[PDB]
Amino acid sequence: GLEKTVKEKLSFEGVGIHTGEYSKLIIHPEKEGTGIRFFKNGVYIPARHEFVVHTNHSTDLGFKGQRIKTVEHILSVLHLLEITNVTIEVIGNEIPILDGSGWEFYEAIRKNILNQNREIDYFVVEEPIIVEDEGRLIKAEPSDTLEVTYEGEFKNFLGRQKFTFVEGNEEEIVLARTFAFDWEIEHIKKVGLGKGGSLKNTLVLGKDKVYNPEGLRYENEPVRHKVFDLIGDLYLLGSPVKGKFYSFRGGHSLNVKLVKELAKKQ
Amino acid sequence: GLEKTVKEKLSFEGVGIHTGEYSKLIIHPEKEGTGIRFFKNGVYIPARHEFVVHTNHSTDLGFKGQRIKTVEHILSVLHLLEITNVTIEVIGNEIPILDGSGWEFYEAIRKNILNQNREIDYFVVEEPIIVEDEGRLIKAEPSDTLEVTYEGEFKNFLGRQKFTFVEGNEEEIVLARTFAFDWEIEHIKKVGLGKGGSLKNTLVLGKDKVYNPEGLRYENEPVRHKVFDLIGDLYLLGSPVKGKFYSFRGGHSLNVKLVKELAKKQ
Ligand SMILES: CCCCCC/C=C/CCCCCCCC(=O)O
Numbered sequence: 001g002l003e004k005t006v007k008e009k010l011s012f013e014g015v016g017i018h019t020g021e022y023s024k025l026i027i028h029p030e031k032e033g034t035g036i037r038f039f040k041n042g043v044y045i046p047a048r049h050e051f052v053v054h055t056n057h058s059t060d061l062g063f064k065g066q067r068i069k070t071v072e073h074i075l076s077v078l079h080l081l082e083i084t085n086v087t088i089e090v091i092g093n094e095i096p097i098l099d100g101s102g103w104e105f106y107e108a109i110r111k112n113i114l115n116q117n118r119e120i121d122y123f124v125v126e127e128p129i130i131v132e133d134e135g136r137l138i139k140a141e142p143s144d145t146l147e148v149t150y151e152g153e154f155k156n157f158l159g160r161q162k163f164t165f166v167e168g169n170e171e172e173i174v175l176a177r178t179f180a181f182d183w184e185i186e187h188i189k190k191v192g193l194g195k196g197g198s199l200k201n202t203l204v205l206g207k208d209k210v211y212n213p214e215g216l217r218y219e220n221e222p223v224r225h226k227v228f229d230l231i232g233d234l235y236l237l238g239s240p241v242k243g244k245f246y247s248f249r250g251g252h253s254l255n256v257k258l259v260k261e262l263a264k265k266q
Numbered sequence: 267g268l269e270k271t272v273k274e275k276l277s278f279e280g281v282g283i284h285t286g287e288y289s290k291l292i293i294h295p296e297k298e299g300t301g302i303r304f305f306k307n308g309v310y311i312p313a314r315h316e317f318v319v320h321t322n323h324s325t326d327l328g329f330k331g332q333r334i335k336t337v338e339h340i341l342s343v344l345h346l347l348e349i350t351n352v353t354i355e356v357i358g359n360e361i362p363i364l365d366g367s368g369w370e371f372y373e374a375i376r377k378n379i380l381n382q383n384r385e386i387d388y389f390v391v392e393e394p395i396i397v398e399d400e401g402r403l404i405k406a407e408p409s410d411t412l413e414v415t416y417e418g419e420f421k422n423f424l425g426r427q428k429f430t431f432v433e434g435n436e437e438e439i440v441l442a443r444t445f446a447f448d449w450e451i452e453h454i455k456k457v458g459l460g461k462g463g464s465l466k467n468t469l470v471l472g473k474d475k476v477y478n479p480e481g482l483r484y485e486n487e488p489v490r491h492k493v494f495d496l497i498g499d500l501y502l503l504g505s506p507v508k509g510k511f512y513s514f515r516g517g518h519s520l521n522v523k524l525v526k527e528l529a530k531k532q
């Protein structure tokens with residue numbers, strides 16, 4: 001595929017799910033070979049694993065004293081659409097969560113794709129690799145196409161379910177929203193997070209209930225969202241990825257661990 | 267005491283807890299003998315029991331095709347400060363919930379009281395009366411001062427608690443907020459209510475937890491609030507009340523039932 005950028009400046013704004021603060025984004029077009037990077041208060045922060053500073057409840061990046069929280073959703077959308085050159089200027093401390101999914105980003109960016117004059121330099125998984133952590137596991141192996149499977153084992157009515165993304169089915173995961181369990185709320189709040197969370201940007205589930213009046217968009221919306229999250233973290237490899245991935249109960253921490261190990265080997 | 271009004275108009279705005287819509291109130295001064303009345307779309311709606319049209323999860327008033335939801339908190343504050351003559355213009359279909367208590371109302375009105383030239387004609391409970399409904403009970407009896415006791419019996423950690431309000435202790439209940447149990451949320455949403463509810467205006471409790479990061483303001487905040495609600499509904503009698511009340515598991519429906527029985531007798 002050919003490298004891509006946006007045809008013109010795109011802007012988004014809204015509350016940040018963790019800071020609870022209002023922020024604004026301005027997606028700037030960039031020429032070939034620029035890569036994906038954020039910009040805040042005069043500092044460019046590459047969307048690469050070396051700049052990850054936090055992975056609890058979100059993937060946060062930082063460099064030279066400037067930090068940006070929750071980059072996983074905008075990065076997933078960029079990855080899915082193969083946007084390889086853009087600057088995400090952030091006026092605030094976190095990416096707006098919007099409705100909790102990548103839908104608004106996906107729709108706006110998709111109709112503004114600009115093909116460029118360079119073949120994409122994909123990060124190709126060359127050999128099988130496995131990372132584990134307290135029951136959690138993620139396996140990566142060679143594949144010409146990007147394939148991502150997430151299998152969850154929830155302690156509520158969701159039980160055990162899995163979902164597989166394959167190229168061409170981007171629309172099956174871009175609407176899946178961020179979710180949380182009611183028994184986790186006190187913890188999240190206690191650690192200074194989730195300050196902007198609400199039923200408008202978060203699917204809140206109980207042992208046997210669904211608090212959102214709109215209910216779930218899909219019976220497996222949570223695992224579709226986990227797949228979406230993983231694809232966003234995978235872009236931290238520095239360029240569109242080609243490989244087959246399987247994640248069992250994975251989260252941002254394990255995702256980043258996998259990325260660093262993959263980067264190290266190749 | 268002397269009838270009272272406000273020295274100057276007072277405004278309050280925010281979201282309605284049930285409609286989830288923006289709403290605003292403007293309290294305007296009125297001369298002696300006017301009483302408390304709401305104004306909406308050209309219609310005056312007296313703050314009296316004859317105009318109650320709904321009592322499930324809030325006390326709503328209506329007249330000639332115009333309705334206003336959730337008048338209990340503003341009326342409670344007015345009753346407590348003995349404000350007797352005002353016109354409350356309403357923009358929207360419900361009184362803003364603010365933080366779920368009567369604090370903002372109380373502090374603003376308290377500093378803007380204007381004594382008038384006429385003695386207040388209190389509604390004096392003359393003989394004992396009792397109303398019941400599925401285990402719930404409320405008893406009213408004679409007293410030179412307003413005394414209100416609420417005893418709750420909760421299906422969670424709260425267990426059985428009681429709280430007694432007496433004249434002069436207004437500040438002990440004007441900070442107590444609206445509360446709901448996590449197992450009731452789906453029902454409330456299902457009946458088209460609670461659309462503006464959030465941790466900022468509602469104390470949400472579980473079988474063993476408190477979701478709000480700020481926790482409870484008082485270990486018995488819920489019963490203090492129930493006392494606050496009853497005092498607001500009692501003002502539907504048309505004037506400040508003098509009597510001793512005891513409510514066991516009472517709610518707006520039973521509160522209004524009591525008011526109507528008291529009104530009938532006397
Ligand atoms: C239940 C209703 C209302 C208000 C929102 C409650 C706060 C939720 C916290 C924000 C969610 C953050 C994502 C964390 C979930 C995870 O790591 O699995």
Ligand SMILES: CCCCCC/C=C/CCCCCCCC(=O)O
Pocket residue numbers: 182204211283322323324444445446447448450451454460461462463464465468470477
């Ligand atoms: C899991 C946590 C929370 C989601 C918060 C949603 C807000 C609750 C709805 C508004 C409450 C309105 C009060 C009515 C309750 C009653 O009459 O018992």
Ligand SMILES: C[As](C)(=O)[O-]
Pocket residue numbers: 017057058059070072177178179229
């Ligand atoms: C837990 As999240 C903010 O990555 O959906």
Ligand SMILES: C[As](C)(=O)[O-]
Pocket residue numbers: 283323324325336338443444445495
């Ligand atoms: C249940 As209510 C809005 O009167 O606190």
Ligand SMILES: [Cl-]
Pocket residue numbers: 056057191
């Ligand atoms: Cl944490």
Ligand SMILES: [Cl-]
Pocket residue numbers: 056
């Ligand atoms: Cl955690």
Ligand SMILES: [Cl-]
Pocket residue numbers: 322
């Ligand atoms: Cl009910």
Ligand SMILES: [Zn+2]
Pocket residue numbers: 001002119120
């Ligand atoms: Zn190509």
Ligand SMILES: [Zn+2]
Pocket residue numbers: 056057187188191
């Ligand atoms: Zn945590």
Ligand SMILES: [Zn+2]
Pocket residue numbers: 072073177178225229
């Ligand atoms: Zn996510």
Ligand SMILES: [Zn+2]
Pocket residue numbers: 338339443444491495
């Ligand atoms: Zn109330």
Ligand SMILES: [Zn+2]
Pocket residue numbers: 322323453454457
């Ligand atoms: Zn109900």
